[PDB]
Symmetry: none
Subunit: 58 residues, 6 copies
């Protein structure tokens, strides 16, 4: 609301360093969501919002 010289880092992912030799991601879905591999979602304010993998269904 009122900052007088601060330093903020609200809602941050910092450093996802990753090392791999092989990678075989094998997804076969039908009617839903799938998210694989590296993922670095970063939000500050989520006002009743969705997931990172949503499946509403019927």
């Amino acid at each position: 609301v009122l900052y007088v010289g601060s330093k903020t880092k609200e809602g941050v992912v910092h450093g996802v360093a990753t090392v791999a030799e092989k990678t075989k991601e094998q997804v076969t879905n039908v009617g839903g969501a799938v998210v694989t591999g590296v993922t670095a979602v970063a939000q500050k304010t989520v006002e009743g919002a969705g997931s990172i993998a949503a499946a509403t269904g019927f």
Copy 2:
């Protein structure tokens, strides 16, 4: 509400260093959500919001 020179880190993931040689992620879903692999979700305010893997169903 009022900062007079502080230093804040509200809602942060910092450092997800990872080392692997092989990786075989094998998902076969039908009607739901799946999230695999490295994941570094980082939020500050979640006002009644979703998950990181939601399955609403019927």
Copy 3:
């Protein structure tokens, strides 16, 4: 509410260093959520919000 020069780390995951040689994540769901692998969720204020693996069902 009022900081006069403090240093805060409210809601932080710091350091998830991980070392592996092989990895075989094998999920086969039908109607629910699944989350595997490294995961570093980090939140500050969760006002009656969701999980990191939700299954609402009927």
Copy 4:
């Protein structure tokens, strides 16, 4: 000397992933060698050869 279908990785550095926010390298030498920062020297056969920081002197 004789390979009949192998797969070799003799003398390799593989993956030096690095994440930083600030960096202040401050060297003041007079009569010697200095090497700083990321360095990924990679050799196979070193037949009585030099270092990665040599100082012969008098």
Copy 5:
């Protein structure tokens, strides 16, 4: 000397994943060698050769 379908990794560094926020390397030498920061030297055959920080002196 004789490989008939093997898979070798002779002399390898694999994965030096590193995460940092600040870094202040402050070297002041006079007559010798200095090596700082990340370093991933990788050799196979070192036939009476040098170091990674040599100081011969007088």
Copy 6:
């Protein structure tokens, strides 16, 4: 000398994952070697060779 389908990892460093927030390396030498910070030397055959920090002196 003779491999008929093996899988070898002779002389390997694998996984040096590291997480830090601050780092202040402060070296002031005169006539010798200094090596600091992360270091992942990896050799297979060292036939009477040098160190990773040599100081010959007089």
